[PDB]
């Protein structure tokens, strides 16, 4: 009766669906070859209608590194949101929130923390769904060098705490560090 | 002829999940005992399950990480890797090909989703994977740490194996070079 996203792992997509998702996200964002590679390897939220894909999103597995005053140091098992895109003539109908619904399901069931990167324009809705704005600096653990701070911008990082270890507590004003990949680390 | 079912961690119900952690800890109770981190590493991607009489008799998982590799031309590849974890067969059910069935499922997930598969196996296991088409890494293995740099991991009786399935178009692997996994807490391989 009402559009919902169905969850499919990358390895269960056939190439005609796989090619449609890449083509659709590229038209909805404009998104390079790397931005699409960052979206492969985990769970896809797909909404299809009238022969075509109308909305898309992905959650892939990374590590988020966090060290508190303790000095302990944690590598959290992270569900990272990628390639959320609603067909242009299909917006304003809640298809976006139906993709986030299915992605958060994945996060809550398989990961210790959700994370995504969003612009100032989009903070209101993410906050309303329970995500937290990360205020502290962000960085990346590079292979060549070590930890390298991510250049400051109007993009914000958001995290969804779901199943953190023993205590961990979590100070969102402290530093947080993602793992390395080429292209955009976030 | 047993076949494995492929289930994502999130689709795992509490029953099916606690049994899997139970079967794997008992199966790997021969090194070190299955720690909390060993199980955490096995969570997050696709599980291959085989069950019988309602009980779980075989398990494996493949989870996504990055493998860092640098060719002679300077390179710099952070390959999208399906890493194999928690391959366990119930002790009384070994011999009937259950492990085969598990890897059958796990290789489908690899070939369908990642640029390379990787696993760590004991010397006694080597033959089973080589006959399946896996390449043995001869080069030194290492791990990228947040505090130190890239540190070698040789104090291990295990051998690294890789399954190239969708390498970036220029890449041809020299299994003689160094290979570096991404950082995680606990056993990095």
Author numbering:
A (entry chain B): 14 to 43, 55 to 210
B (entry chain A): 15 to 44, 52 to 210
Copy out sentences from the published article reporting this entry, exactly as the authors wrote them:
Three different classes of enzymes are well established: ATP-dependent phosphotransferases (O-phosphorylation, APH), ATP-dependent nucleotidyltransferases (O-nucleotidylation, ANT), and acetyl coenzyme A (CoA)-dependent N-acetyl-transferases (N-acetylation, AAC). Here, we present the crystal structures of an AAC(2′) from M. smegmatis [AAC(2′)-Id] in its apo-form and AAC(2′)-Id complexed with CoA and different aminoglycosides (gentamicin, sisomicin, neomycin, and paromomycin). Collectively, the kinetic results indicate that AAC(2′)-Id has a very broad substrate-binding specificity, similar to AAC(2′)-Ic9. AAC(2′)-Id was not active on streptomycin because the antibiotic does not contain 2′ amino groups in its chemical structure, indicating that AAC(2′)-Id exhibits strict regioselectivity.
